[PDB]
Structure formats: C-alpha cells, structure tokens
Amino acid sequence: FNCLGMGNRDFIEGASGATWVDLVLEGDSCLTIMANDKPTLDVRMINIEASQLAEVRSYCYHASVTDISTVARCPMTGEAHNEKRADSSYVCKQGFTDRGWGNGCGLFGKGSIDTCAKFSCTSKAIGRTIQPENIKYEVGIFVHGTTTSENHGNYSAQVGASQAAKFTVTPNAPSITLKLGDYGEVTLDCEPRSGLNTEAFYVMTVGSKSFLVHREWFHDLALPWTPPSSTAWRNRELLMEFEEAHATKQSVVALGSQEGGLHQALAGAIVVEYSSSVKLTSGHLKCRLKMDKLALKGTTYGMCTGKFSFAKNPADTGHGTVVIELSYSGSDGPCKIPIVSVASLNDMTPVGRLVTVNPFVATSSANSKVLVEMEPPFGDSYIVVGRGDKQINHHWHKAGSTLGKAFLTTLKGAQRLAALGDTAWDFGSIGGVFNSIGKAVHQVFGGAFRTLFGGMSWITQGLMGALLLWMGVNARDRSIALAFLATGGVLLFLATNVHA
Amino acid sequence: SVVALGSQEGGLHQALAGAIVVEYSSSVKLTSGHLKCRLKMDKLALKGTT
Amino acid sequence: SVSVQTHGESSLVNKTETWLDSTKATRYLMKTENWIIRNPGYAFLAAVLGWMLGSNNGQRVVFTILLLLVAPAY
Amino acid sequence: SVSVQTHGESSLVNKTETWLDSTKATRYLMKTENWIIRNPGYAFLAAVLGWMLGSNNGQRVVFTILLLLVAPAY
Amino acid sequence: DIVLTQSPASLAVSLGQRATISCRASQSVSTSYMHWYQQKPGQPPRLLIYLVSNLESGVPSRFSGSGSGTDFTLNIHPVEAEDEATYYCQHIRELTRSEAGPSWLEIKRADAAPTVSIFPPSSEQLTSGGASVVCFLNNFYPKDINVKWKIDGSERQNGVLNSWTDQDSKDSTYSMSSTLTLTKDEYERHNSYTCEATHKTSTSPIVKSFNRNEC
C-alpha cells in the first residue's frame, strides 16, 4: 500500500499549478508524489481483482483409450461401418486391412475396416473470459506523516491516523473520494475498464494453477477442446493414434498428459493465484489524483527543544533517497522535528529536500520513534537532526550524479515508452500541446506500425532490425532515413530491453 | 513458489516422429527387418518327374 | 527440449507406418501459416523487401518466399 | 500443436518473472545450433551460396547468415 | 458426468480423536478443486476446506485434508462437539457441479438403552373416534433401534408413526417416539398393546405392555 521497501519506487516532482494529476500505476511499482502544500503521497496497486468470470470453453490435454473396436470387412465393399459411430463418445476412423485368402477374405491386396475407440479424458484444462465491469482494482494510497518502522509498514495503524487508505475502483464506480483526516481529502478518478484490455485475453487453468493466455491464441491452440456445457468435443482424435491393421487387430494408443506441453506452451504467461477473487500481479490503471482538499496543517508549530536519537541507522533506499528513523527523547512534544540535509557543517543552508515533508512528533511521550525520509543532493552531504549543540549528524554521499541520472531518466524514459503502449505519455501528466500530441503522434503509430507487424518474438524482430539497419546503408539523399525509420528505436530497443 | 512442469510424455511422443512402434513380451519383436543371408540350394532338387 | 529436435526421420530401411507420418507434413507449414495469419501486417511489408533490391526480377521472389518462411519461429 | 506456437510473449504490462523467461533465449539458437552441428556438411556448402551471386560483397553474408538460419526446422 | 460419494456416512468418534474421511471423485484428475461443507439438519452448510489445503474465514484451524485427482480427504484431528453436523463436499472442473452422499459426525459415548413408555390414547381422542397409541423411546445410543407394535401378541405395521430426533445436544443420545394410530372401535376390539424395542444395548427387545382391561 505504501512505497516503503518496494521493488520499484518512482517519484513525482510537483510543479503545482493544478490540484489534479493523471498518473498510471502498477502492482509492483509505487508512485511517490511531492508537492507544495501537499504532503508526500504513496500511490500503488495492491493487485488486480476480478469478481465474475464466465466459462468460455475447456481443453482436454490428457486422454486414455477405452474399448478398442474394429469391424473388419472384405475388399471392394467400400466403406466400413461400425455401430459405434452413433455415439459421439466413441472415436471412429476409416481404414483398411490388406487381405489374402489366409485371413478373413477371398480377395487380395485391399480391404476395409472401421476402427472405433471410446474416448476417455483423464485430465482437462479450462479457460475463463474476463468481463470489464467485474474487474476490480485494490489501490493502496498513503500519505507520509509521523511514522515508525511498524505503523508505516502497517495499514490499519495508519488508518487510525487516517494516513493510509484502500478502495476498489470498478467501471460501475471509477471515482472514489477518501479522506486523509487532519491533512484533508483527496479525490481519485480512475479508469478501471481501460486500465487493462478485458477482452484482449483469457484466463487458462492448467492443472490446479490458472494462467493468462491471449484469447485469439486461446482458440488457435491445437489440442482436444470442450464446449461450455457438457459432452461433445472436437479434435479428440489428436491425443490418440493408429497402427497397421493385421486381420482385426489394430491398437488405438493415446498420447500422454500434455500438461507439460501446456506449461511448454506457456512462456510469457503471468502466474496468477486466486481464492474468492483473482489477484493479478502486474497492474495497469489510469487514475486522477485530486489534491485540492489535501493541505498542510500546523503552520504555527515550532522546533523541538531537546535531544534526538537514532531508532535505526541510516541507509540508502536505492531509489536515490535516504531514510532514517528517530526516537525523540524530549518531552516538549508535540513539536516540529528540526532536521535538514546540508552540504558542509559550516554551511547551515539546507540543500537536500525532505522526502517526508514537515516531520512532527506525535505525542509528548518521551523516546517516541519517528521515521522520516529525505533526499540528499549528489556528492558528499550531511544529515543533521536538530539545531544548536544537541544536534546529532551523519555523513552521506551519493554517487548518482546527474550525468548518469540524466540517462536514468532518458534510458528508463524510453523503457517507460516501451511496454506501456500509448499510455506511456501519461507520465506527461498535466499535459497538453506537446504531451497531448506526443501521445497522439504515437497513438496512430501505436494503432499501426509496431502493432501491425507485432507478435514478433525476441530475435525475430531483433535480428531483422540489424538487416533493416543495412537498409540505411543502401539509400539515396533525402531517402536515407526512409528505410531507417522503423529500424532505430521501437524495434531494436525492446530487443535490447528484454535480453533475457 | 517452485512450480513443476507437467508430464512431458506428450512431448516425448512429440519428440518421436520416425520412431518405429515396437512391442515385446519375453523377447522384443521388431517390425521392419534388415538381414543379409546366403541361400544355398545345392541339395534342393525336383523329384517326381515320374 | 522434447518439443523440437524430433527423431524424424529415421530413414534407415523403414517401410512401415511410423509413430507420426501423415502429421509430419503438418509440422512446419500449418504452424508457420498460423504465424503469418497471426501477423498479417508483417506479411504486407515482408514481401516488399524482395522487390526493393537487386532488380533481377524472378530471384526477388526467392528472397520473399524464403524470408517469409524465416520469421515464423525464427 | 502444443510444442510450437507458444504464448510468448504476452508483452502487455507484465514486469514480473513469467513462466519461462530465461529459457526463451535458448529456444531457437541452441536448437538451430544443434541442427547445424547435426548437419555440418550442409554448413560447408551453405555459406558457399552467398558468395555465388550478386558480387555486392557485404550483402552476400546477408544471404548466408539468414539462409543458414532457414534450414533448421525449415 | 462425475459421481461423488463420501464415507463413512455415519462416524461415531469421541471428541479429540482424528477423523479422516475416505472419499473419491469418479471423473478423474479434478486437480484439487474439492471442498468440504458442514451442515446441521435444517441449516445451510459452511465451507470448510477450499484449495484442499485452505480454510475459509470463519472455519477454525482444526479442519484440514489433502488429495488430488480421484481421492480426497477431510482430516480433523481435534474433532469437537461443535463439529457435530452432516459433512458435505462438492466438485469443480467439469460441469454440472454436484455433491456427494454425505457423512455424519457423531460424538462417541457409552451405548445407552432406550427408556420406553407406551401411552394409551387419551379419553379425548377416543371421543373423537380415533385412537393413537404412542411409544416414547428416550435417551438411547446409538441410533440403531427398532420398534414393533404387538397387538394381542401379533405385530401390526399399520398406523405406525415413528418420530425420532437426531443426536441430542445435552447427552448426545437419540430419542424416538412411535405412534400406533387406530379407530376407537378397532381400539376397543383389541386388548393387549405393547411396543417391543430392540437395540444394540439390550440383547432382547424392551417390552412395555398394557391392556385395556388392565387399569
């Protein structure tokens, strides 16, 4: 629900100018909003939920042969007919048995037989189709107040402080307004139906576990399949075989369990669990964060008059910021916690910015732990907690200097452009003009081009790109980039994006 | 979660294409034979022109 | 893996009904045809590359019909 | 069949560990390399066809490296 | 297409002893997709085990089980008096979804003999034209029991109305009420009325008799 210790933690730089913002989020990633008058926010997906799922069809991967029956007939008799062709449970096939005068017939060289075997399915997979309204999204939202190592990673604890909230956005109710208490209220307007594509794929159950598969590939699977209701199947002859015909003897043999082949047929499928409601891991949702009633209280506070202490030692979040936990032994609380991030000790001018804005002591109780995060600048810096001689400080250094960070925005920005489709420009939030046409140019470019030849797998589009790079070598003036258009970017990039 | 692949028996049957189906009981009986033999007819003759 | 690199074909003696014979003709084509039907937009620009280079006419198709078979399953 | 025409890749959202990811790089190459090692005598005359026609140098390899990838699994 | 049956249909076992239900599913390889329901008579059930490894919310941790394919199990090591109910199960994968012939939990105790009381019809019922001779069998365990209405030494199966309860809440025994309905004229033309109750406890039927000429 919060951004604490998440695998992917990305931030948001507030330019103010508007109280509303359109952001896209994910299950693994946690967005962090920092703005003026608005405290630090956490926005992430818990999982993707779906309420009602219809049964599209099923697939029998594992079968067994039962009741082999072959009716032998003489040559020149034409078709052979076994009485088992009436029931659909019996799998019947034409054929022949080369006849002499020794076996069953008075003619030579030819024959006719009808081989029937009752079909028995040992194991079958089942698919699911997703309805748009049934899709639910549990979106953890959190605002950073006074926190500890316990309550901050705790939900119900911050609900008592009204600093964390959960909710379910559906196409029936895409808009939800939740109050943060002392910090005001925020309005979240999401797009549940359009976050994913509900009809783009199915949910296939292989064995006990269920998995995601494209629905156009779902019907293109070659394997005996099943209608929703009960009985009559199609292509059930594929799991069984035939042999030579000696007199009346022909053995219908069944293929083994194809479950492994189904697991082999699954490559990019996402593992999905379930109990009452299916929980999808990687989220895609378009929400609107309205901060209008979110504000800062306590404008009249002052600094804390007493000693600090470290409840836990400082470390690096790996996302570019440094978090600390402080146990304040002073009894003068509630008080605004003095703290900064400075370049040198002789220079009291704050440089680094606090990730958690306005650190505050909850209650007058001494030794109360408080967890506050800050973003120091690049190079050698210092974490200074408090003013006057009772401040206790710490030295920090961060090698991520904007040279490499410019590429971390650039390179990941193109990675943000990839795999997000046309929604990639939603990071262009509070947009228009550029950001609007930047998505619009890529809109039809996303509705054509890459999606037209899309479906290429790994080196398929990657290898030919190197051959399409040769198209840029042979060309004419003003015709150079014409053969080079789709080559560089959008093609080799995603090939370099996923290596492996 | 360590998850196991399903039965590869089908994949083994998929891995089999030009394989010859062979049965057995106490001695394996292969269908298509290849053997080089020498037929000596020296003692084979015709009787019974009588 | 067991999915690819099949035993087929033995091609030693073997005049008989093998394990899979009639289905051997459906191995590549149908699965590659299901790929090119999967990706029609590629097939439009695919054959275009043949007419681009060499100006030798009939061998330009040798590019396409071979290259259109490359893309399925790499 | 289930052996070919795999789900891979989804390529919708999906930043996660999929069912088979690291093994996706070993799909084609290794199985096609096991094919060209299976048939080395072909590989000798294979790349010869590239140097035969067109006299355009560097694009003659474009024939080979592409055509040597065609023959495995057709 | 699938047939389900749960066994043993009635299990008498003391609280705290493990109860492992032998079960099965006819259509095979259900994967897991098997459940367990506890239902007291006259109530809706409650889902015990789903995923075959996992409880629902309200059901306490004493419920467990394992299985796949055909066979499945419900294993409760600390069976309790609160566990007394009719156990149900139900299947998924194919359709239609159906259940099994259920199984009863019974808390084990000492075998108890019935208290048999056979009451002649009231004077109010005789004046109404009918006569119903009732036979009350109280506090007997186990549930296996039989009543036989012997009129003048001859058994009559006509007009026999047998109303018996389930396993009691207090003493966990069974109580039965048998009723022999006759017309007053048919009641006054027959003299000796007795209901003999045979039970696993008493090797001989418990005979409570009265005659109209007697009192």
CSV table of C-alpha atoms in Angstrom, one decimal, chain A residues 26 28 196 201 211-214 217 220-223 258 261-270 281-284 419 456-458 463 467 470 500, chain D residues 1-22 24-29 56-59 62 65-66 69:
chain,number,residue,atom,x,y,z
A,26,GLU,CA,1.3,-0.7,-11.3
A,28,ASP,CA,4.9,-3.7,-8.2
A,196,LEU,CA,-6.2,-3.3,-19.0
A,201,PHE,CA,-7.0,-12.3,-23.5
A,211,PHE,CA,-2.6,-18.6,-16.1
A,212,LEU,CA,-3.1,-15.8,-18.7
A,213,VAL,CA,-3.3,-16.5,-22.4
A,214,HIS,CA,-4.3,-14.4,-25.4
A,217,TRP,CA,-4.2,-17.7,-29.4
A,220,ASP,CA,-5.8,-21.3,-32.0
A,221,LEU,CA,-4.4,-23.9,-29.6
A,222,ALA,CA,-4.2,-27.4,-31.2
A,223,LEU,CA,-5.5,-29.9,-28.7
A,258,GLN,CA,0.0,-32.8,-22.4
A,261,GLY,CA,3.2,-29.3,-23.2
A,262,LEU,CA,0.7,-26.7,-21.9
A,263,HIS,CA,3.4,-25.5,-19.5
A,264,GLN,CA,5.7,-25.5,-22.5
A,265,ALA,CA,3.0,-23.6,-24.4
A,266,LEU,CA,3.2,-21.0,-21.6
A,267,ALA,CA,6.2,-18.7,-21.8
A,268,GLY,CA,5.3,-15.1,-21.2
A,269,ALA,CA,2.2,-16.1,-19.1
A,270,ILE,CA,1.9,-14.5,-15.7
A,281,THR,CA,0.3,-9.2,-10.0
A,282,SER,CA,1.3,-6.5,-12.5
A,283,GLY,CA,-1.2,-3.7,-12.6
A,284,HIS,CA,-2.1,-1.2,-15.3
A,419,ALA,CA,5.6,-1.9,-22.9
A,456,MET,CA,7.4,-10.9,-33.4
A,457,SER,CA,9.2,-12.9,-30.6
A,458,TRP,CA,12.6,-11.7,-29.3
A,463,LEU,CA,17.6,-9.9,-36.0
A,467,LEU,CA,19.2,-6.4,-41.5
A,470,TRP,CA,21.6,-2.4,-43.6
A,500,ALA,CA,16.6,-12.4,-21.5
D,1,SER,CA,0.4,-28.3,-31.6
D,2,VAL,CA,1.4,-27.5,-28.0
D,3,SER,CA,5.1,-27.9,-28.9
D,4,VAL,CA,5.2,-24.7,-31.1
D,5,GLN,CA,3.1,-21.5,-31.2
D,6,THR,CA,3.9,-20.7,-27.5
D,7,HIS,CA,2.1,-17.9,-25.6
D,8,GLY,CA,5.3,-16.0,-25.5
D,9,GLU,CA,5.3,-13.2,-25.4
D,10,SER,CA,2.4,-11.6,-23.6
D,11,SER,CA,4.1,-8.1,-23.8
D,12,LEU,CA,1.1,-6.5,-22.0
D,13,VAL,CA,2.2,-4.7,-18.8
D,14,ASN,CA,4.0,-7.7,-17.3
D,15,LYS,CA,7.1,-6.7,-15.3
D,16,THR,CA,7.5,-9.9,-13.3
D,17,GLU,CA,9.0,-13.4,-13.5
D,18,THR,CA,7.0,-15.2,-16.2
D,19,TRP,CA,6.6,-18.9,-16.6
D,20,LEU,CA,9.6,-19.2,-18.9
D,21,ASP,CA,11.8,-16.2,-19.4
D,22,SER,CA,15.5,-17.1,-19.2
D,24,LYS,CA,13.3,-18.1,-24.0
D,25,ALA,CA,16.8,-17.1,-25.2
D,26,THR,CA,17.6,-20.8,-25.6
D,27,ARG,CA,14.5,-21.6,-27.8
D,28,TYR,CA,15.8,-21.1,-31.3
D,29,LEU,CA,19.6,-20.6,-31.4
D,56,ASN,CA,27.9,-6.9,-53.9
D,57,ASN,CA,30.2,-8.1,-51.1
D,58,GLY,CA,28.8,-7.3,-47.6
D,59,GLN,CA,25.2,-8.2,-48.5
D,62,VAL,CA,23.1,-11.3,-45.5
D,65,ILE,CA,23.6,-15.8,-42.1
D,66,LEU,CA,19.9,-15.6,-42.9
D,69,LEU,CA,19.1,-20.0,-40.1
